[PDB]
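Supplementary notes (optional reading)

For those who missed the lab, this is the record we used. Protein: Streptococcal Protein GB1 Backbone Modified Variant: Aib10, D-Pro47. Length: 54 residues.
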Amino acid sequence: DTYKLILNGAGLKGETTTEAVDAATAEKVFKQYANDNGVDGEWTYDXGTFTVTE
């Protein structure tokens, strides 16, 4: 399935996607991604779309 991350933090704004078997798997990918980019924020998830917005 295609999952989307809408990111807003650490001087960056982005929209990226990852292909994953389920939401929990996509969530690990996106949370690691956010961490790699110095983003520490609050998260939402709805219908395949994640947001992280510090």
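If you only remember one thing from this example: The CA atoms of residues 6 and 15 lie 5 Å apart.
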